[PDB]
Design a protein around this ligand. Structure first.
Ligand code: CL
Ligand code: CL
Lengths: 288, 287
């Protein structure tokens, strides 16, 4: 009955839902305490084409976390969740925060959502992408790449489920115990399916939910996906159960957004379905 | 018909104060919140030490300008403000309210004076003075505690009827609704926490149990104002919004007290925020 605590190190968007504005409320609604460290405050998502923002630097990130430690709270952190990093220095600061939390609490784990934004190519771009690919797997207990991010982490083109499982297993050999492929581009899947995968050293699960066609795809679905998975794991779910709850909860939010003809996620409207999804999509076993 | 509130307050990473006490309860009550964080603190200042980052008044206006630039400001149904660290920040909040009301003339501004530890009838120069002198003409609702109400009214207030009259005099200055988020009633038993809600035509007094914490939790005032704002946005009557606020705040405070914690048990008590299991019906009062 002990409440778990997650330190969530992500961007904050005032209007709309991305980063901590997509992650904090769902985890709280799922019964987990969230300590949101906002690395930047943006007026709105960058996909609108223009925005205003204010960021903190890496030194300030460390100072803020020092404050949480000074009152004795940081050692009670049960998990760290990271997302978008605005600069290489911020990504390095995230790693140092994770190292401190894990040394204070040997049961704490780090879940890294690469959160590379709009990008492409197998090669990691210099700076943040390079740092995510080269440095983060060594400390991460779980990672939640989308397809593009998985190709960068693995250094490979990936087109099938089996190729993706193999890429996940190679990444797991670098450190992480679980890879949640939060969106998989499966050339063998029907076009109206949204595919996800959950891979550990000994398990692999495929899941599918309906793919909704948006004029512009909502930002924040990846951040929401990682957050729900983390919260369900903290609530004690097995890998399969956390995976299935994530798939079903994200479906409910995305469907609500589509039915409302909206671009920003219908996160608050769909909150009861985040906590207790009504429609379920059982996963099935796959392998290399 | 989802409503949106722009909440302009401090953010605290660990624990619950400002937006870290206001945003989640309003969301849990079915209202969308756009949080504009004026500062980011590691923890609240009552611990004695803390770290913080901050934005200035110009950046606050620039951030809202960004929302306006994508055409979203017309979707703002209310603005909620609380503690202000400087007169410049309070003036930036006023400019933001003006910008919101230009895009949505139906939007309303709810000001929690949030003066903190203070005393006396005279407002202190600077922020307190601005709240007393300039805020009522701009705010559609205000949630003073007892000390703040005395400063707003320029009067000593000791009875419920005196407090209603002070609220009515303040309402004649601009606001449509006053929530006295903690009322000092010399005729009430010491173990009662009194609140009052007043409009030009209604006045409701209510009570929940007063708990004697060894160190009183921070953020109860922020939680109270936020729940009331959310219930009003959901369309509650004055009395219903008032009673839900009293019962939901009780549930959170009781949960915190029962666990002997300092930080509010906000997430643990979330179902009681939405559906309080113990109710404290209000009663009519007047001048
Ligand atoms: Cl912030
Ligand atoms: Cl109290």
């Amino acid at each position: 009955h002990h409440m778990k605590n997650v330190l969530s190190i992500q961007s904050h968007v005032i209007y709309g839902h991305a980063g901590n504005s997509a992650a904090v409320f769902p985890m709280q609604r799922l019964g987990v305490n969230v300590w949101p460290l906002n690395t930047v405050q943006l007026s709105n998502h960058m996909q609108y084409g223009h925005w205003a923002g204010s960021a903190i630097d890496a030194a300030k990130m460390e100072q803020l976390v020092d404050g949480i430690a000074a009152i004795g709270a940081l050692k009670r952190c049960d998990a760290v969740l990271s997302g978008f990093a605005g600069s290489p220095a911020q990504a390095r600061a995230t790693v140092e925060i994770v190292r401190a939390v894990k040394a204070m609490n040997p049961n704490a784990w780090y879940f890294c959502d690469p959160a590379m934004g709009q990008t492409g190519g197998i090669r990691p771009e210099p700076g943040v992408e390079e740092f995510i690919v080269n440095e983060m797997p060594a400390l991460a207990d779980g990672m939640s790449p989308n397809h593009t991010e998985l190709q960068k982490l693995a250094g490979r083109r990936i087109e099938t489920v089996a190729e993706a499982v193999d890429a996940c297993r190679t990444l797991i050999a670098r450190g992480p115990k679980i890879i949640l492929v939060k969106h998989l581009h499966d050339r063998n899947s029907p076009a109206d399916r949204f595919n996800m995968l959950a891979v550990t050293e000994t398990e692999a699960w495929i899941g599918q939910r309906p793919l909704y066609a948006f004029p512009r795809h909502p930002v924040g679905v990846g951040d929401l996906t990682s957050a729900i998975f983390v919260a369900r794991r903290l609530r004690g779910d097995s890998v399969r159960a956390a995976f299935e709850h994530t798939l079903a909860a994200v479906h409910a939010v995305v469907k609500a957004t589509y039915d409302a003809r909206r671009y920003e996620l219908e996160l608050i409207a769909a909150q009861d379905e985040i906590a207790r999804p009504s429609e379920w999509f059982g996963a099935w076993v796959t392998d290399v």
